[PDB]
Design a protein around this ligand. Sequence first.
Ligand code: MG
Lengths: 338, 347, 335, 309, 335, 341
Amino acid sequence: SDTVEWFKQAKYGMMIHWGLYSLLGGEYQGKSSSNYAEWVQSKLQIPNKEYERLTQAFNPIYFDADAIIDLAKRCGMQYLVVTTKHHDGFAMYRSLVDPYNVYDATPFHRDVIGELSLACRKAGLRFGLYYSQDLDWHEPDGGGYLSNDIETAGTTWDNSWDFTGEKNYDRAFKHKIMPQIEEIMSNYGEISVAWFNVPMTLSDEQSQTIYDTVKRLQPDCLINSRLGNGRYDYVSLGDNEIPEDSDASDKAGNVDYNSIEGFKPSKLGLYETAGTINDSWGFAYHDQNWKSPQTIHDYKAHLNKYGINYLLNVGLDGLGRVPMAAEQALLGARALEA
Amino acid sequence: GLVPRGSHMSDTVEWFKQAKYGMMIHWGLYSLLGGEYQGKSSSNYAEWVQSKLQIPNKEYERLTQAFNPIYFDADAIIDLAKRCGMQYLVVTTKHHDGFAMYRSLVDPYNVYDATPFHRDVIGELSLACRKAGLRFGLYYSQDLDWHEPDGGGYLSNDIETAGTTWDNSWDFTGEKNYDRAFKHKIMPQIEEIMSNYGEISVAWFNVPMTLSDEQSQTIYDTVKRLQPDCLINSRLGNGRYDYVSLGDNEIPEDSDASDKATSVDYNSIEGFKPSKLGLYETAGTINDSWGFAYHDQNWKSPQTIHDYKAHLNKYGINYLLNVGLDGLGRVPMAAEQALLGARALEA
Amino acid sequence: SDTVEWFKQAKYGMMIHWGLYSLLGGEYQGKSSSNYAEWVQSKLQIPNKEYERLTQAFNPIYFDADAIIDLAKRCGMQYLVVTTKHHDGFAMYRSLVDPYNVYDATPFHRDVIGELSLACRKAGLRFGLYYSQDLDWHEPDGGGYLSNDIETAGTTWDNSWDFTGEKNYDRAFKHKIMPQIEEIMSNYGEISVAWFNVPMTLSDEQSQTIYDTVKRLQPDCLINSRLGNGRYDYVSLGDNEIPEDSDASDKVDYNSIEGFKPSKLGLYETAGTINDSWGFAYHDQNWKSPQTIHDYKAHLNKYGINYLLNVGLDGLGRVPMAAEQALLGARALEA
Amino acid sequence: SDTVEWFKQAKYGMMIHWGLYSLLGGEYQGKSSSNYAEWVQSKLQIPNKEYERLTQAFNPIYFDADAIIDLAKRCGMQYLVVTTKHHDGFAMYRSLVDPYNVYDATPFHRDVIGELSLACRKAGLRFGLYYSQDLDWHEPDGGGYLSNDIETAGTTWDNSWDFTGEKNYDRAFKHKIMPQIEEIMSNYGEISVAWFNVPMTLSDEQSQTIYDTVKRLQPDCLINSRLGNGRYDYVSLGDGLYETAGTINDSWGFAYHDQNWKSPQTIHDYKAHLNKYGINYLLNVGLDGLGRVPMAAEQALLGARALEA
Amino acid sequence: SDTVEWFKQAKYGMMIHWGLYSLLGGEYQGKSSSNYAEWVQSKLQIPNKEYERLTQAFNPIYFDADAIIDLAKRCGMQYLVVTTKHHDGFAMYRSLVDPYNVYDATPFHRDVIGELSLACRKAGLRFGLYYSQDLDWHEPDGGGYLSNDIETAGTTWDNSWDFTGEKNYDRAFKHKIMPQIEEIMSNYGEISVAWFNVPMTLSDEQSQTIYDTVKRLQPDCLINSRLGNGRYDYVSLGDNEIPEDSDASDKVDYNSIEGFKPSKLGLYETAGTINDSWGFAYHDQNWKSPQTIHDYKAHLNKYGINYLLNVGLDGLGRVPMAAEQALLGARALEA
Amino acid sequence: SDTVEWFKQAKYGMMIHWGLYSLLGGEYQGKSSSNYAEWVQSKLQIPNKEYERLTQAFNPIYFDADAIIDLAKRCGMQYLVVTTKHHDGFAMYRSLVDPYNVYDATPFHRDVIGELSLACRKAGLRFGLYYSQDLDWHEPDGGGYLSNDIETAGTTWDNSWDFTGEKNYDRAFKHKIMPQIEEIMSNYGEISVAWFNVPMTLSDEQSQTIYDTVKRLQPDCLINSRLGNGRYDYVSLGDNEIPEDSDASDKATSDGNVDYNSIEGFKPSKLGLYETAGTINDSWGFAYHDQNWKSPQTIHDYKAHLNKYGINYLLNVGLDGLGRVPMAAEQALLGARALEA
Ligand SMILES: [Mg+2]
């Protein structure tokens, strides 16, 4: 495969997390998110009716897809993966299936995914899509409701505060998850990476259905291991997981295909660690724990030396900007390369 | 204590002498930028960003369309002040960028007319203060106005600032005459704010870089005409004041605080000046900025706030402690917690 | 079927009529509707161009799905059936097929059906959907143009004033009716009741096509007899029809809307109004008393007939005070 | 005075009550107004924060000033008196003094008083203005706070729920009442009638200041006996120049549940009785939330006209 | 076919070009083109990001579909063919597939094609649709990038200023072109004429796919020769092509847009403009006289060729006065 | 006066006509304006209720004050005079007195006069304001109702179709005219020229009141003769009036009394100041169907002829509905500039 040989040498990509959570920036009504500001709805059990009010404050006058792609290109990043829909269920593209999206529901009235697709194509960057296929806090049958024995970066995995009755993920899978995956894999050109997440609920068959649908629409798209249940083309390591040299040299009993930490089998020999510059995925006002240029440089070098890609995230602010400290960290790391 | 119903029975002078502690609010379009613009930093003063980065008015004005602070709640801000034992609240009606935070008939560059928010922030804070029994004060940039070709500061650019120049020297590069801005915008807006928001206890002017003694006097007399009990700070300039504002964050050492010595540049903003009435105030910040600044997390501790307040008050100096609201109209969590923490150290 | 045994014992449901007609409230340009305010467009032959202007006045700041469902629940009602689209053709949900709907066309910019679905699910009420499958005054090929020998609550059954040429219901059936039924039966979760109406035009095959489509998307949904042509799971009696003992003890024009019809499953329902209109009507204060509501309910239920009692929400999205008081009063008469 | 001789023979006028209260139509949160729907904010102590939400629902697509005036004219009404601002304090004209008004605060974004002024002038009806000078539930210092020993069509005369501190009408008088009276008596052409309330709170001096201001701006405007200043042009009789104001049903504001409309014959007979004694009949219409004359009101008026020949 | 015999005797139709280009009227930011105003994005290489801003200025308060159709009818025109989407890629109908359209993207918030469809039906005019199936300057994979039959020479017509990389029309064909053709052939009633254009990229198979899809959805729709590759029911001559007697009496590059081509059914049409532009152009006052229009029509018709005469509406939705007067004047020259 | 010596040598200025009429562009319901497209409301007796609909179509995304001033400057024009309010009564600035204005009533929501003032100041062009003090078709008491024996570029001078009863200009003078003049002479910096028009109704006292008000607010502002009644600082000739050599030499059209409220010919000028305002085509407002653009040579020669007699040439641009200078207008202006050394 051309995509396979490409991904093996791609080395470095930019990830983007952006959504309504970015406006809150890790604070709400005088209380804090966890280190993951994008989990704030769960952490503080924000009712959908309240969280939806953020739509009216979403008018990011500084968002400029071409400028973001240009920054990625100047840093030597070869692909960009963006949140089409995170756990809160809010789509960052024009979804016919669900009007809870950036185009229909906000004054911004623009398809963010559309703009980033176009910018990537112009600049010659490959384009990837993140989608929360399991969790959806906007849906009564969103995933996570069987997993609450496992601690989260919020409270529960699912929206357990608005929705307290019988739940069946199958219904959300059929009505929202699969239709939206069809939208994003149809409407934005060639997709090189599909980034799924936290497969807490979906069955082997549901993972397979997604896998097959993605490949039908996007034959060369690489799917990451967090689609769950062994249905994937490359392995995502844990959040910010920089494996020890020894373990990265082995890339290594039973594997839990739905765990998100550590190595898993990879027939194609493809691996990626997604990481953050500070400690959040979403923008977080009070997290100034930005990794230094030296740290970023060394993480990238270590991953790449062992055949692992580094997908480094930017959490855009409420105005659509790369935080200055994020940009300076990225450019600083780039300056340390020959 | 002989006043009309609805007024404070304590005379403003005796009140201010014992007031000890007030809240200041800085809020405007600069709060959206939060100390950054196009990948570049403000100075420590995020509200100075327009000058620091010479942002053209045509660009800066675009911020109006992003100003929809759905979490602004005047009653909640007043409640925080009151529970912390603050006895007054002083709010930016218009800062150096020239953008009004009230419904100005004189100038549509304001929060009511120019933003989707379409609400009179000063009006809401006035009403909240009245309901809670807090005295209400108004900050107004009478000299600098970066939205006005004749805004002040154009004679002062030999002196370093928290931006670049004192004036807007990038959009406006020709002949300038502050007198025109004084007549057309400054005096009319002062008349608005001193007329339309009830009883005003404090008038907080700033950086008197340009206005003449006569212009200072004209302001002083107009404020007193509209608001006979309003106390005016020393940064109106030229000796026209009722109380002395110390420097920004100026906590004088015991010896200086005791002596308050002057035997004076009336247009300087540092150090003591004469006060016939014996009234003094230090305005300070919880972090290092007046406006909200995303990258300034240097929040003073509860203990520091408590100690600063106690030190100032022991020497008869009031502490006016600022909150820079964010773009959504919120008190930053660390600021709220610092204030509540300081309150917990009293009893 | 679980839905069958449920419906047999459900006894009592709330119906909702709400639309652009609710703003007019039974008056337009100084003239009155009939007793049916929701028929005003036909009664007064309001041109579509004029009627559509109502969209801009539709901003019901007091609409609260949770509060409506809570009132139903407090009254012992076990299900709620709501107008997704009445005869005027205006959809009260986000229809991709047709932008003449509450989400796309009004400042309210909210999916009313979506909000009611969510509220019903949270409170454990079963949810039903009303759809005018035959009449559509917004469509040149809307039904009713073969039926004008039969008296109406307006003028004609069809829009005969904007559309005066050749008509063919098959075109509207294909392009609007079936696609919208697919939307409402796909996008709002489990649907327990489908309430069709006034089958003045559609063929046996068209009734069957709807029936099959509803069952495909909603296997447990019970369909009422006004789908027409014998394609149904339960019998709807006439509007406000409280049957006399002889007929009710015993329980055929399949497209008539009055009287009994065969019911293989033994399921029956009378839909009624608290006043005399389905839609909100400013000048109709003829509210049935608590005792009348109580007695109608008891009478219907003793024959195994469900009582589906309608509320016509006002232009602000409110239950009229007199309607709320009637319902709560009736509930107070149960021991 | 030309206005004096005119008013003596005018016989019949239309009054209009219209405001945010008209949207509620005598109900709020499942509770009733009294017979006076326009008093609902007081009756049910609706907080200003909640009541103000009505602004967003105010888009009366059927409001047509020319059509209202044409109805008045066809019935032989010679003047129209309209609510510029009722007790709730919401102005139905573009007020520079206060943005709580129909132009600035609603999607309708139109000056209702302006449109009615123009319509009256085109049709040759004299134009009159009603203004609540004492009560103002939108103002902390609105009047009524000395009068709560007297029962009302609501609860208290003042807003006693949002505003619970010291009250001094002098402040509202200076900042809102006098400035708004100056607006309405300046910006809408010749005003023939000024309709104020019976003063619960104003001083003699304040009533006099209003009288003098009106006459200064509108030298031919008639002031009636309600104003309380002790100088007036005509006597406002119960709710040689005289006028009785009345309603067609029992509410001033539109009230969905009041269908107690007076018959054509009643209106005809009442008007004839008043006119035989040299009393003008000022008959109110309460427009609905869409800006319409209720059908039964229109039918009553035209019916009464048909009984004259 | 009924449409075949109808088209043979129809003789005279109205064409409408209307879009964002109509606002610019051949001028843009200190530049101008006297070529076809609807081509201004290409002729002045206006970036999509700039051109899109025109959406916010599009509020044609004078647009009145009934009035346009009534003008056509009074002139004896028997059909109306309107731009659903021209080369700039902006749809003049509510497209689910692409929000770059007059309903979703402009304050006008109205379906222009929908309104014209309804107006035509009421007046008894047949309705036709123009769609740019090949060029689409809003799409990176829009057609035009393969120089048609002449090597290089500047003879590409894609958007080559915004989109400079490798291109594959098949992607746009699948994702935008075919879905939109399905929309317009599904959602606007009976379509009598399909007017395609400049087939310089699509394959014979792609032409066939369009042809078959149009016929599936609209069995009576006649397709013009500019669909390309021989897939058509009638021959479109060149723009404004008034053939000489010799050529007209006699009547092959299937993808050329000039001259005669074989016509099994004997159906032919020349589309022409009243001035020299299809879209409205501020500076083009070169209006043909009544006499010229009359004589062109007679010349075309005497050879069995229909005359499809275009109106370019202005930015307010109006027929330019000189255009209306030319058309009515030509009508006055008929008995 | 500095302004007097300045105006005498200024020679050449730009005028701007822009308003709701620019959207119609001289056509309405299939009917034509006269040569003056800005008079279309009167020509076709458009009811105010209908004309007001134009506000919702006014969103001129290509308006750029700096670019308009830059064109003026490139052509050697030394001042710019813009319509704050023409006969239709629609204000092109934020008027507190009247919400029928470009800021309050249109999606554009921008103060056109404010933007032009700022652009003029940055570029060092003097700034002038046009205001229709007499006619106002939006006001029942607008002027013109005594003058309908005299033909116009529409029908009547006044709005005689919406307003058919008794009229008294005094009311409009007090409530709209004087307050708006106060606004525009207060809120837009130093004003060098005040351009009034068609003084069909106002009295000598009313002309004087305006004159005094303008001078109070703008001491150095030069007021043109169309204020009426002899109350002026310089003489405006007729529309597009290029006087014959003999008359231009004498600065006189006849030997006796002048009519101070006529708009044609010379009048006395104590300060020796004169100006002809003219058009590039035949309309003041933008006109879709008027392509009768004067040639570069004509513009050059008109300017030279006027200037040789100490008469200024104030040449108008009628912006289109998008806020643009028509290309043919720009090309005529730059063409004329090219013919100067
Ligand atoms: Mg009274």
